[PDB]
Design a protein around this ligand. Structure first.
Ligand SMILES: Nc1nc2nc(C(=O)N[C@@H](CCc3ccccc3)C(=O)O)cnc2c(=O)[nH]1
Ligand SMILES: Nc1nc2nc(C(=O)N[C@@H](CCc3ccccc3)C(=O)O)cnc2c(=O)[nH]1
Length: 259
């Protein structure tokens, strides 16, 4: 029913990852909403359930596969399927709880985690912050195996949480931000794993705020500046959508566009 995009970490290259992220973005956005050259994700209000999700099938060199489900309104990873079992994060509201009942309906074992899927909760369970969790093709390869083996008891909860953190950043954050996609491309190009620097972290943390500031802006001009960080941790201010056009690939819907 829902569209499926395939990616493998097995022999992954800059080009194959680029093709993957492009395809994810294409399935997330309809083209109906572009503001200051930046696409906006579908509005959740009145969005039919048959259009609510996309599926990301991740394969690895170990010949294992897992399927992530992403909410098109925000690119949120709501859960995953591995073989005969599916696992969903504790839904944030009743609407999102109803929505996940439409996912992996043929699966033998359905589970909802007692914990939500936001970074703060996942970092708590992992026993590590995003700033200390390595990203790259190797981490993703390993994350796929960890998600696959969870149902059989091979994967400890901190490892599972860490693995979610890897997947979310390398798929959802990369889809949201050309900048983060670029950072992942670099890791893949040189096959060098590394934790995300402050520029990546602050962009992730600011996605909602940046989306709102752009959409509420006066002809692109922010009413209030937004503070981001450089690679070295130094602060720089964003006053305008213009500087964000090469940085942000997708925005969450926050308000109606002005006439
Ligand atoms: N399962 C899952 N968890 C996610 N968690 C976050 C996350 O917690 N992000 C930031 C900013 C707030 C935010 C931004 C976008 C979506 C939700 C929440 C933070 O609070 O540090 C971000 N994205 C996702 C995601 O795509 N899948
Ligand atoms: N399907 C699903 N979606 C979820 N989305 C979020 C979440 O924080 N979503 C926000 C993300 C964008 C945002 C806006 C304003 C400030 C920060 C971040 C949204 O869609 O407005 C949390 N949890 C869930 C969840 O459990 N299931």
């Amino acid at each position: 029913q829902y569209p499926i995009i395939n990616f493998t970490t097995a022999g992954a290259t800059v080009q194959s990852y680029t093709n993957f992220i492009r395809a994810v973005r294409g399935r997330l956005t309809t083209g109906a909403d572009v503001r200051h050259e930046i696409p906006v994700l579908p509005n959740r209000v009145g969005l039919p359930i048959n259009q609510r999700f996309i599926l990301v099938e991740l394969s690895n060199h170990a010949e294992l596969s897992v399927t992530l489900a992403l909410d098109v309104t925000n690119a949120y990873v709501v859960g995953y399927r591995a073989g005969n079992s599916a696992y969903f994060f504790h839904p944030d509201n009743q609407e999102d709880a109803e929505a996940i009942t439409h996912l992996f309906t043929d699966v033998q074992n359905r589970y909802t985690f007692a914990f939500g899927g936001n970074y703060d909760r996942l970092e708590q369970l992992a026993g590590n912050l995003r700033e200390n969790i390595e990203l790259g093709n190797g981490p993703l390869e390993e994350a796929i195996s960890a998600l696959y083996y969870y149902s059989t008891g091979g994967t400890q909860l901190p490892t599972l949480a860490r693995s979610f953190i890897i997947c979310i950043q390398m798929i959802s954050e990369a889809a949201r931000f050309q900048y983060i996609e670029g950072e992942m491309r670099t890791r893949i190009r040189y096959n060098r794993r590394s934790a995300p620097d402050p520029s990546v972290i602050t962009l992730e943390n600011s996605w909602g705020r940046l989306s709102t500031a752009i959409q509420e802006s006066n002809q692109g001009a922010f009413a209030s500046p937004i503070q981001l960080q450089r690679r070295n941790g130094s602060k720089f201010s964003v006053y305008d959508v213009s500087i964000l056009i090469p940085i942000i690939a997708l925005m969450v819907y926050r308000c109606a566009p002005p006439p």
